[PDB]
């Protein structure tokens, strides 16, 4: 059985083939317009890929239950607090679902060998990708499913760390009801995994940590001249 609240969250999920196809196409034209001597570095393509993912994340939030009831200023504060966390959570879940070991699956539908990416990503991003892979492995061993994924999406979006909100009560309420729905859902559907609910919640600080460090690295890369919506959110 599925709590009705979780069904309402599921109804807000985007059309994933369409989201990925749109991003794939954008990046294809990008490289096509570029002449022989001005192709995008691999880090550069990842920045544009992340940029375009953020557009789809904003569109998802905008139309989502509860979020669409916030005034725009509250909506902006929430997204500014969690945009990198939603990026990384989406990345992690993509590896959980489609991930083979030794490769990374991108929002474009491309599968890339890890040895290729690790050669170019540099020590810091390799470290953060490695931590993310550790979460992938843990979530895979717990049978992390789509109902739990959308719960964590809304728990990341409706964060209690965001202050100066006009309607903090709504954010507090969504946090509490989604938590209660996830606690109930994991019991009913995975009764033998006592640790599942706790193991899911403990990933959120870890994703937060990875995401905040990811932001700090990218802000450094921007200040260093190595990098749109991505810059605005930074």
């Amino acid at each position: 059985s599925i709590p009705h609240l979780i069904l309402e969250l599921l109804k807000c999920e985007p059309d994933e083939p369409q989201v990925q196809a749109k991003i794939m196409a954008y990046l294809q034209q990008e490289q096509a317009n570029r002449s022989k001597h001005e192709k995008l570095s691999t880090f550069g393509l990842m920045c544009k890929m992340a940029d375009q993912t953020l557009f789809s994340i904003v569109e998802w939030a905008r139309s989502s239950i509860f979020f669409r009831e916030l005034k725009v200023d509250d909506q902006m504060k929430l997204l500014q607090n969690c945009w990198s966390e939603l990026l990384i959570l989406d990345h992690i879940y993509r590896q959980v679902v489609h991930g083979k070991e030794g490769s990374i699956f991108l929002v474009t539908g491309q599968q890339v060998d890890y040895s290729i990416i690790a050669s170019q990503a540099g020590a810091t991003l390799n470290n953060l990708m490695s931590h993310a892979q550790e979460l992938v492995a843990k979530l895979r061993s717990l049978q992390f499913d789509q109902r739990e994924f959308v719960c964590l999406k809304f728990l990341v979006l409706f964060s209690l760390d965001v202050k100066n909100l006009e309607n903090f009560q709504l954010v507090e309420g969504v946090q509490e009801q989604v938590n209660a729905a996830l606690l109930d859902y994991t019991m009913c559907n995975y009764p033998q995994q006592t640790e599942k609910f706790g193991q899911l919640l403990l990933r959120l600080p870890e994703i937060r940590a990875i995401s905040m460090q990811a932001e700090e690295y990218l802000y450094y890369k921007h200040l260093n001249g190595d990098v749109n919506l991505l810059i605005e959110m930074l």
């Binding site: 569109e59 905008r62 902006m76 997204l79 919506l229 605005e232 959110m233």
Partner: peptide, 11 residues
């Protein structure tokens, strides 16, 4: 963040 406001307000 004018861009984020626009993405939330646009029709």
């Amino acid at each position: 963040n004018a861009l984020l406001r626009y993405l939330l307000d646009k029709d």
